[PDB]
Design a protein around this ligand. Structure first.
Ligand SMILES: Nc1ncnc2c1ncn2[C@@H]1O[C@H](COP(=O)(O)OP(=O)(O)OP(=O)(O)O)[C@@H](O)[C@H]1O
Ligand SMILES: Nc1ncnc2c1ncn2[C@@H]1O[C@H](COP(=O)(O)OP(=O)(O)OP(=O)(O)O)[C@@H](O)[C@H]1O
Ligand SMILES: Nc1ncnc2c1ncn2[C@@H]1O[C@H](COP(=O)(O)OP(=O)(O)O)[C@@H](O)[C@H]1O
Ligand SMILES: [Mg+2]
Ligand SMILES: [Mg+2]
Ligand SMILES: [Mg+2]
Lengths: 475, 469, 56, 470
């Protein structure tokens, strides 16, 4: 169970001895720092260091712990900020968790699963109506830097207060000032009462940046095995991939496409397949996932992006030209899809917008044609007018989510065509004015839709009678 | 005469056989270990031989995770390759890479087992009869007819419609065919496999089907050998029983990718775009076995993933020489909401010969490609010169090409959640009849928005009346 | 009208001459950028290949 | 024995063997002091930094000065700690090398306290979260990319686009309102500019409140790599042991990454991407996490980042974007058109551009400016062929206002008086917001587009138009 260090450099070490070490085991240096054995050659063990390595010298002793990589889990982690390992980083004392679980685990099998049929409400009009997310689904947020990727993930976590959901935020490669600002934003909105924050900052050893998403996954699956729903966010998987390239090149493993290793697809596949909706036999639990990716110059075609887009159950693309031109949130409807879309919605939302993505694609195409055609037949004029109104109804400012019962009432009025006379600039004022009138005059419709979760014929007459009272004030 | 583990390098493992009695290439090895003390872990693993080294040593690829492996353990040589159960007792079951059941229905009691590596048929015993196989899909039934007993390839990038097209073909061809069906989910999502299994259980189609999985979360060793396990089961129905069979495969690119992932660790020099020096050889040993012999036929539908919408990447480029029909899915049509998004210029098959198809089928298909090829070059000009500067023949071609391109769209039965429509089937005579009226200019008056997600051409006129025109 | 139609055809002739010249200039500048990209891709690809072969 | 022997020399890199069990730690500073014993030898005083433990009592070390003249078998001393630099108020008004030795010729510095160059950053509990605008008087920065007090500002650009002229103008404005200790680190740049700056500081009297560290283009890779850290260890003492606010100016953060790449190739490490080191993001983060504000006091830093070609996708420019609170990108097209500073209004952004931090009037004007500039970049590819004769109504009016807006972002700097006879100008935030608001509204649609070139305030455009009479 004992060895001696032979090489030390850049957070990587080589040891002699350690005959009984297992692939993936934990090892301790004389300094008290931990390391993980990732290579087992005929004469030398290759060790990845899990902390500061400037105190480890050649000829120092290394000892076998006798345990695989393990992290502590429980409900007591809620409202706490923690390291990639089982250690607190906030000024709030010890964690006192009840049990420990391995960092590497196999995903649920084909028969252990169930189809996704219940929503994960984001409170964002474009995502809930066009790109719906269900509990157990894996959804990707993608774009270049400074496009709103973090804002969509945090707005989603803030919208989980009413529901019986636990959220996990994993920060990989992020700057410490941003982690403190995220934690304080979560505290102002009260989200810290039902969330966990796992952080491995940029100045942290690459080895800890690797383990951060897997440890965040091990903490999420604990709630899922009991029967409770859980959500996990990964702030940058592109920074996790960049981190993975360093130890593999320092351990001298051969490169591949770009300079990344051959195991790059397997890295993110091992992680993202643990997110599932389990069957009634397993307790019906659900682990949802929201990975994030940064792509240079806003190009979809690259090694790390295409690997992850090929693993998830959909994706949300954010475009900087949409952002600089007034479209917020800056989501491109043509490149964004949900592989579970339609089943992950309440019946009222399917009845109201089951065909919105296809219709909003006819208009997106017609924009490129109409600007050079200079001819507009009546059927094209009618679609340009409706498409403009729907693109305005989908705009939404920060930190102001829409409950589903309000989202199905405005989209019902827009898709039925009641907004025909209302001028384009006026639509914004009509939406805000009409939604405030619903919460005043006969609020029965708003409450009845919330309980039933379906639009019937009574709720259609009740609503068609209401939409005509406000329009009677116009020209 | 046993062996010992010497090096553990992620998926690759090295084993030394001291007696000199080394295992042959592709043989299967077993590691079964009981923990001696509290520090160790119990292990159950299979590894296949890949290469013979010099000092009584062999390189092997593991079929499951190598965590917990210790140098100096004991390895048993089975004496043969990975042997999978074969016969009628495999029908209505689900399998792993090793041919073990992944469902909870109990053991399989099949009297025979066959190795996943077998020599392909010889030139002297192949067959090549030609007939039209109907799909009920407007694009495929007209522009790229499926040859019965032939290989079909669906090419596309991420999220263009490949799996939604495979699923519609299984719910059309297999639902209109007597004989066995086989499906292999090569390196795909384990959520999609579950939904497919439930659809089969409901419909009753499992009784005539076999399923093999070994999904995305499995190591590289399992992700490349899964296609061979599904193939050794479809071969028994052709060679021993004589029945015709369908073989459906999603993501054959994961088989090529998984071979590249393990190639560097074995010690092979790299090749173009970061692929193994044996790409064409490895895809040929898979594709050359899925053929129609004198005894029976294997019709095959395969989905191919194009890494960045670039057909010139080594894996998609190596695949094109083996197909009998090729269908290319383009994101350009998907972004416009035109589904299934089949490219009407790049799509072709071995059956588009004037001697095989009807006269009007051949004429309508060639006229569709010419009008769309003319429109393709002309639409680019319109963006800089403007539509007012072009001639009347060009304006007529633009107006008709827009309607043709939209009438190629159809609502699938498996797409109800994504389309908000029930789904429809169109027979070959209606596909030919419908496209002819558009080409001849009969419906020049109908608006271009009356062809999205429709079925038969009669519906477009009814839909235009509902649109008050 | 005679002078107006003559001046219209003269104006369009000059406009089309300039449009064609602007497009021909854009084609050579793009062609040179494509040749730089072509040579850059080949040297990068050959160096990734040789680095991998040297490592192995 | 605390001493070692030289076993190999390979340009900047050297290998030293020690006695069994008595080896120096990673980052320890070693000394070679040799006096020639025969006419064939040469005399050397040199220092090296440990980088790797290589096995067999051997260690690999980088050198801080030229290795020409080293012989295998020379004796090496172990200091027992990293490169330690003198610190305190006594460093004010002085200039130094990478080793903390003075290059001023004013004599020694009182060695009261010495700090090692390698130390950890402030933890999450120690950091401070508050945002306020630091005003610089430059129109494009104050409107589109406002500076966060206590944060990091990055100026990206290619060869000859104006990064040094922009930093010199920033020092003449921010360091004249900050009213606290200032620090300048010259990393891999011209020694002629360093000399001009030092002389200007003396005539202005500003030297009494500043510290200067230099590592120039002629220095070996080991020195170009450690100079940014020497300037930072001195700037850090003032915000931690005195509690004062500090300014840190770094003229090239790109030469720090480039020097790491050059020495990495010599250490025996496998390459990555465009031949860079396999430790690029970790080496840059260790430097940039230390450049942070805490509850005691704040560090505000201005950095100039070189781009290898007119390509921002290069590994070094690409990794630094994640660490900045404000980012300013300089484009060659604006510089060749004559628009200075050549800041791109669509690529430049700041973390302070949120409705909560800036005034409502500022937020509307800044967002309305980027919409017109993005719309004009969409028309740009078609007008390159057809020209503006085909355009009608709003698209034509949008280019008419976009021309005026693009020119009103140009400003005559005080440091530029040596290139053009025009006097420099400082523009307050209330004047930039009012001027752009009137340009956007259309109150100045009658004035010609040539009347907004190199001006300060909107009233100057009115008199410049009146001078022209057109
Ligand atoms: N809907 C919106 N309306 C207005 N501003 C928005 C909106 N969404 C995001 N923003 C703003 O744009 C910026 C987005 O920062 P965010 O972190 O979300 O982007 P990012 O892609 O993750 O960038 P980074 O890589 O730096 O983290 C912030 O200033 C944010 O407040
Ligand atoms: N026939 C269709 N009708 C409507 N929408 C469709 C149709 N076909 C595909 N889509 C949309 O496009 C998405 C494509 O998902 P799909 O599973 O088919 O991806 P894919 O091409 O198979 O990619 P991958 O092989 O990686 O899974 C669907 O989830 C759906 O949103
Ligand atoms: N405000 C300005 N007015 C006029 N010329 C300028 C201005 N800013 C930059 N330049 C010119 O552009 C170049 C900028 O030099 P410098 O700032 O040293 O370039 P670099 O970006 O490489 O550091 C010089 O030729 C200088 O004269
Ligand atoms: Mg962000
Ligand atoms: Mg698929
Ligand atoms: Mg300079």
């Amino acid at each position: 169970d004992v060895g001696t260090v032979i090489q030390v450099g850049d957070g990587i070490a080589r040891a002699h001895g350690l005959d009984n070490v297992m692939s993936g085991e934990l090892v301790e240096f004389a300094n008290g720092v931990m390391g993980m054995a990732l290579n087992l050659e005929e004469n030398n063990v290759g060790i990845v260091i899990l902390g500061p390595y400037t105190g480890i010298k050649e000829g120092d002793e290394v000892r076998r712990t006798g345990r695989i990589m393990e992290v502590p889990v429980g409900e007591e982690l809620i409202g706490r900020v923690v390291n990639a390992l089982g250690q607190p980083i906030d000024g709030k004392g010890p964690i006192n968790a009840k049990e420990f679980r391995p960092v590497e685990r196999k995903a649920p099998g084909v028969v252990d699963r169930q189809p996704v049929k219940e929503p994960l409400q984001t409170g964002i009009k474009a995502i809930d109506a066009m790109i719906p997310i269900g509990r157990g689904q894996r959804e990707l947020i993608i774009g270049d830097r400074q496009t709103g990727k973090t804002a969509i993930a945090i707005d989603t976590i803030i919208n989980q207060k009413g529901q019986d959901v636990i959220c996990i935020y994993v920060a990989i490669g992020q700057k410490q000032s941003t982690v403190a600002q995220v934690v304080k934003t979560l505290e102002e909105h009260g989200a810290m009462e039902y969330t966990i924050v796992v952080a491995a900052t940029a100045s942290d050893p690459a080895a800890l940046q690797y383990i951060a998403p897997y440890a965040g996954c091990a903490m999420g699956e604990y709630f899922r095995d009991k029967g409770k729903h859980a959500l996990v966010v990964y702030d940058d998987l592109s920074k996790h991939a960049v981190a993975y390239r360093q130890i593999s090149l320092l351990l001298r493993r051969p490169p591949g496409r770009e300079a990344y290793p051959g195991d790059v697809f397997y890295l993110h596949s091992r992680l993202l397949e643990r997110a599932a909706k389990l069957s009634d036999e397993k307790g019906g639990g659900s682990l949802t996932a929201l990975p994030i990716i940064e792509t240079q110059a806003g190009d979809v075609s690259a090694y790390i992006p295409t690997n992850v887009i090929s693993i998830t159950d959909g994706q949300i693309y954010l475009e900087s030209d949409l952002f600089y031109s007034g479209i917020r949130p800056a989501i491109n409807v043509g490149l964004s899809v949900s592989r579970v879309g339609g089943a992950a919605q309440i019946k009222a939302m399917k009845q109201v917008a089951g065909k919105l993505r296809l219709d909003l694609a006819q208009y997106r195409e017609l924009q490129a044609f109409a600007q050079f055609a200079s001819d507009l037949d009546e059927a094209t004029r009618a679609q340009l007018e409706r498409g403009q109104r729907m693109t305005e109804i989908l705009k939404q400012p920060q930190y102001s989510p829409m409950p589903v019962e309000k989202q199905v009432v405005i989209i019902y009025a827009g898709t039925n065509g009641y907004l025909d006379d209302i001028p384009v600039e006026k639509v914004k004022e009509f939406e805000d004015g009409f939604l405030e009138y619903i919460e005043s005059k006969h609020p029965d419709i708003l409450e009845e839709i919330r309980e039933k979760k379906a639009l019937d014929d009574e709720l259609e007459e009740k609503l068609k009678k209401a939409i005509k009272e406000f329009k009677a004030t116009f020209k | 005469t046993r062996g010992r583990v010497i090096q553990v390098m992620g998926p690759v493992v090295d084993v030394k056989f001291e007696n000199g009695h080394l295992p042959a290439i592709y043989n299967a090895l077993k590691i079964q270990h009981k923990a001696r003390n509290e520090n160790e872990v119990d292990i159950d693993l299979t590894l296949e031989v890949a290469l013979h080294l010099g000092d009584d040593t062999v390189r092997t690829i593991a079929m499951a995770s190598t965590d917990g492996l210790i140098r100096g353990m004991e390895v048993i040589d089975t004496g043969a390759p990975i042997s999978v159960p074969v016969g009628p007792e495999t029908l209505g079951r689900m399998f792993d890479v090793l041919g073990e059941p992944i469902d909870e229905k109990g053991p399989v009691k099949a009297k025979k087992r066959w190795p996943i590596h077998r020599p392909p048929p010889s030139l002297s015993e192949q067959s090549t009869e030609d007939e039209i196989l109907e799909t009920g899909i407007k694009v495929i039934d007209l522009l790229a007819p499926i040859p019965k007993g032939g290989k079909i390839g669906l090419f596309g990038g991420a999220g263009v419609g490949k799996t939604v097209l495979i699923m519609e073909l299984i719910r059309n061809i297999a639902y209109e065919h007597k004989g066995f069906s086989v499906f292999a989910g090569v390196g795909e999502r384990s959520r999609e496999g579950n939904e497919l299994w439930l659809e089969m259980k409901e419909s009753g189609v499992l009784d005539n089907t076999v399923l093999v999985f070994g999904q995305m979360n499995e190591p590289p060793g399992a992700r490349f050998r899964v296609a061979l396990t599904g193939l050794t089961m479809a071969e028994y129905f052709r060679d021993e029983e004589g029945k015709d069979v369908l073989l459906f495969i999603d993501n054959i690119f994961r088989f090529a990718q998984a071979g590249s992932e393990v190639s560097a660790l074995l010690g092979r020099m790299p090749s173009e775009v970061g692929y193994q020096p044996t790409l064409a050889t490895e895809m040929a040993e898979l594709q050359e076995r899925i053929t129609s012999t004198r005894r029976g036929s294997i019709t095959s539908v395969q989905a191919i993933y194009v890494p960045a919408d670039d057909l010139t990447d080594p894996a998609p480029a190596t695949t094109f020489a083996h197909l009998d029909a090729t269908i290319v899915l383009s994101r350009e049509l998907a972004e416009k909401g035109i589904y299934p998004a089949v490219d009407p210029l790049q799509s072709t098959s071995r059956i588009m010969d004037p001697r095989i198809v009807s006269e009007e089928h051949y004429e309508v298909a060639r006229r569709v490609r010419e009008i769309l090829q003319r429109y393709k070059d002309l639409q680019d000009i319109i963006a800089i010169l403007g539509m007012e500067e072009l001639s009347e023949e060009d304006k007529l071609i633009v107006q008709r090409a827009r309607k043709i391109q939209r009438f190629l769209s159809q609502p699938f039965h498996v797409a109800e959640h994504f389309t908000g429509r029930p789904g429809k089937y169109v027979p070959i005579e209606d596909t030919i009849r419908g496209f002819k009226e558009i080409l001849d200019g009969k419906l020049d008056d109908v608006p271009e928005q009356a062809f999205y997600m429709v079925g038969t051409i009669e519906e477009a006129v009814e839909k235009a009346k509902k649109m008050k025109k | 009208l005679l002078d107006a139609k003559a001046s219209e055809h003269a104006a369009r002739m000059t406009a089309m001459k300039n449009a064609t010249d602007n497009a021909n200039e854009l084609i050579r500048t793009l062609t040179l950028s494509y040749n730089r990209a072509r040579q850059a891709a080949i040297t990068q690809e050959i160096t990734e290949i040789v680095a991998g072969a040297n490592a192995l």
